Amino acid sequence: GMNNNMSLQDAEWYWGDISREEVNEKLRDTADGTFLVRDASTKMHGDYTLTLRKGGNNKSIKIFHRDGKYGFSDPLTFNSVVELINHYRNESLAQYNPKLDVKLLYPVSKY
């Protein structure tokens, strides 16, 4: 239907399109680490979007695409944000900037 054998699209938060609107009634402002994906219009310039709370700040969150896989998320060849879900599930990701650094070990996993 929509890329079956490709991309993780199984990292909980990567449920796969949760309906924008829903995203409003899904993580209106629950808590950080409440990753989630919805995807929509923004397809060309974006991997599969994403919704998360920047510690209650809320920015927008969204994944990009580069070489088939994600983008901003190190466009080297990383299309699995699960290895970290276990490998790095606490420590922050404020590498070059606190773009996210809000955790992601607590995916909405479709309430």
Binding site: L27, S60, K62, S73, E91, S92, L104
Partner: peptide
């Protein structure tokens, strides 16, 4: 808001 922001990168812990 909760629009769309390009950024992520494996947690890779702090730095």
């Amino acid at each position: 808001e909760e629009e769309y922001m390009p950024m992520e990168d494996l947690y890779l812990d702090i730095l």
